[PDB]
Amino acid sequence: SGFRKMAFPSGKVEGCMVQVTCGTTTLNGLWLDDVVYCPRHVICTSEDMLNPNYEDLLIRKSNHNFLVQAGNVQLRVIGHSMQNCVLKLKVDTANPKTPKYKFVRIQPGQTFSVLACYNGSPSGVYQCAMRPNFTIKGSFLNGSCGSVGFNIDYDCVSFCYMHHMELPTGVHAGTDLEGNFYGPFVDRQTAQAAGTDTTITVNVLAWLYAAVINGDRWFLNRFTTTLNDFNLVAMKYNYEPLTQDHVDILGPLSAQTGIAVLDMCASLKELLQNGMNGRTILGSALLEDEFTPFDVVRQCSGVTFQ
Amino acid sequence: SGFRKMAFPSGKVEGCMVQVTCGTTTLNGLWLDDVVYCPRHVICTSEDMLNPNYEDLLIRKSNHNFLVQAGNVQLRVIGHSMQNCVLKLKVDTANPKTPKYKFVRIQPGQTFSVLACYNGSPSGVYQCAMRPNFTIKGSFLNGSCGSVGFNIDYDCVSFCYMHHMELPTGVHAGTDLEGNFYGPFVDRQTAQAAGTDTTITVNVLAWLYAAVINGDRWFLNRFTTTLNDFNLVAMKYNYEPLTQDHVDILGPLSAQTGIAVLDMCASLKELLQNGMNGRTILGSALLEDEFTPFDVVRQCSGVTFQ
């Protein structure tokens, strides 16, 4: 038993990280088959980035201006192009360690693992959720751009995120591997507002189920509620509205625990209105929303990948 | 910026996990050079485990009774022996993916990454601390035994933990890779008490520094304190006593932040005596103690491994 914020094993992604260098800028790239993906601002200088004309800047670059290094060995660049906010460098060598993979554009509320890298080398791995306002709450320093977020489905790696920037509020923004930003962001160094950020209600409920599965049940009550009445309290506390689709998604956990979804909503209501009153749930004094249902079932049935 | 509970990249350990099967019991083993390490209770049956006579049980086993599988390929067992609470199976094949490695016995308060496995296959990776009472707060299900905890020093993997059991309080216990338990535990299915568990004071202070480095500073005050006066409040709240050695260890963080260690202790005093009063620090409503100083410096300077 026990419940921990767990990342996917990172091995298959580790073998795809490379170092990409254009002038004095170095960041991380992702090497799959004979293509290296990285953020296009690798071609900027410190002054470019207030308002880069990326098309104009890339025209001044040729293949040999891109230095790509995987470990100690240099890759030869034989073609370059820009897709949205990412650069694709065609290299002479197919990555022998390329995993089975997919590019996916994830939905808000979904989670994924981040392999934080510097200079093409892994620093660490952690779990993140795509917030409803399309930011993530990561740990990223200068040089971290091009680090990626991924899920693993048995043997397939689904890449979903590439890191590009930090917003004034300290949160992080990035693109899918087609180079489209999540959210309204652009790759220039200006003040940019994210949304008002909301709490992922279905994830909170899933974590309350995890807590019950794992011996924490003090927060359970004798009340119930309705979808509309709960939703009415959701808006108050800036929670996403709960839908029948979410209820259905919680079905397995409601079945495992014998606790109807609306009964759990009622418990969640007395937690929002009354706070936790000094208590804790699964070692936290806050309501956690970065576990999908689906995450919860994964830990509690021991799913594996290798 | 940002601060996240980050695990080491798991690739080098992933290539060492195998499946070990003796009768109907299956668990994980660690394959390094031509040796597979696993918990010795792989030789028990469900009734043995109340009071196993491990020496007697192992005598009934021969090499061919141990089925070791790395992926789809079977390893041949050519010798077996018991060292403390671990079994060492000598196999005919040296693991081609063996990393540079060390076995180490970690100290309470130190942290390490856990690669949670089932049937020889990775499920996920997360960070843990060795608690002062020699337990860890993990996520482990049936079948997880033999999963290991490790650190990485550039290219060297230091294995420090192998999982064996869950205690009645829901926490986890295990051995070093020489098969000696951390703490007073024995590998039998009885009620076993861990210590009173204390809070790792130096780690809390390091996390308060991380919070300051990362823009959270509301908890800072105009007071200071003395080592003995703070320690006197430490005992009250069941914190480890703070020593000059700890102060010295915090030196770099005190230098980075310009906040003297004893000034931070004073802030920690008004947090313990007054609680957080509804506020948060680095996204938590509790005082976190599973970051060593050393962890904090690692994230905040971007250390890498590959």
Ligand SMILES: *[C@H](O)[C@H](C[C@@H]1CCNC1=O)NC(=O)[C@H](CC1CC1)NC(=O)OCc1ccccc1
């Ligand atoms: C690329 O590695 C870097 C990641 C930033 C660095 C600090 N924390 C991060 O997440 N991204 C940038 O430097 C981008 C440049 C892109 C063209 C926009 N700019 C940026 O993030 O500005 C905010 C910032 C915050 C703190 C320190 C430096 C820059």
Ligand SMILES: *[C@H](O)[C@H](C[C@@H]1CCNC1=O)NC(=O)[C@H](CC1CC1)NC(=O)OCc1ccccc1
């Ligand atoms: C081995 O895989 C397993 C790990 C336990 C299983 C549940 N959570 C864990 O951490 N270890 C055991 O089954 C050991 C057997 C060793 C000889 C002592 N026994 C044990 O942990 O008993 C407690 C327990 C708790 C919950 C479910 C089963 C067993």
